Ligand SMILES: COc1cc(/C=C/C(=O)O)ccc1O
């Protein structure tokens with residue numbers, strides 16, 4: 001039967017024990033899921049040497065995910081789009097397979113606590129019933145500032161796949177996109 | 193009927209006109225192919241602030257492509273492997289589809305001119321009949337040194353795909369792997 005994810009109870013890759021103990025409550029609040037057989041979940045972490053609000057300005061741009069994500073041919077949200085929960089975007093993915101769209105819905109948007117998340121509601125790709133949450137957190141040590149971005153997901157393991165198959169693929173993509181987020185926002189910071 | 197690729201006649205993305213005019217003969221010599229209908233070819237470029245021999249030490253490691261490539265679960269070359277042309281490696285790719293192997297053959301290995309290339313001879317993935325060449329080149333300006341890596345390929349466009357589909361996917365992967373090559377070798381340089 002069901003199980004609760006345990007991401008809030010171990011140190012995620014890319015994060016220090018010190019940082020974890022500061023975020024353990026945010027991980028349990030926003031990066032916990034109830035998974036069933038046939039699903040897999042993961043938590044990824046990325047340090048960014050940039051202020052929180054700098055990183056969040058990119059993370060929250062639901063209509064321009066290609067700003068920090070790879071493998072996006074285009075993204076459309078149609079006229080009269082507003083940055084509200086329930087809005088959707090059509091993401092055309094670069095996959096070496098025929099041109100297919102991923103319809104995605106904005107699930108969360110908290111400008112004060114820096115939390116967002118989305119769901120893949122349609123699309124013929126390898127991430128069926130995908131749902132993820134991203135949170136942005138600030139850190140300080142002797143007047144030095146940095147940010148930690150946490151991103152988790154739950155997703156179906158396709159029939160004929162191992163959980164390790166799907167998890168390793170999803171982790172790689174998320175991890176790669178967080179490195180681009182780091183570069184983009186650190187450049188934005190070092191340029192003012 | 194057949195056509196010759198024209199990569200040696202335009203400035204590839206990631207390279208300056210100055211750099212191109214220096215490499216135009218190497219591009220025609222090593223990065224030209226005869227493509228037929230149903231194939232596509234591309235040339236990618238990446239500047240690396242590291243000496244040529246530093247970048248080449250990684251580029252030539254046919255048995256450890258995960259050193260600078262993404263989406264590789266593992267790579268095996270079996271005992272008694274030697275770095276000779278004709279050798280092969282089994283690359284297990286991270287693709288969100290079931291665990292599948294890419295058998296690849298070393299086509300070129302020139303330690304003096306810094307040229308290597310390989311062919312995908314077996315594997316059920318989106319890069320059928322893939323063949324690529326990588327060359328490493330040195331540059332100088334006022335005692336400052338940098339390297340340019342050029343990587344081209346030819347590959348089949350799968351039935352039901354646009355050429356733009358396949359090219360955009362292959363370009364993204366190669367481009368991403370060259371950025372990792374840049375980071376890895378620049379770190380290797382700045383550490384001696
Ligand atoms: C980068 O953004 C995305 C990538 C995918 C990838 C799907 C696959 O490779 O199966 C799907 C939806 C996305 O929004």
Ligand SMILES: COc1cc(/C=C/C(=O)O)ccc1O
Nearest residue numbers: 261262283285294317318319
């Ligand atoms: C990173 O190295 C490789 C990636 C692939 C990808 C195949 C696909 O996604 O269809 C194939 C062979 C490789 O050596």
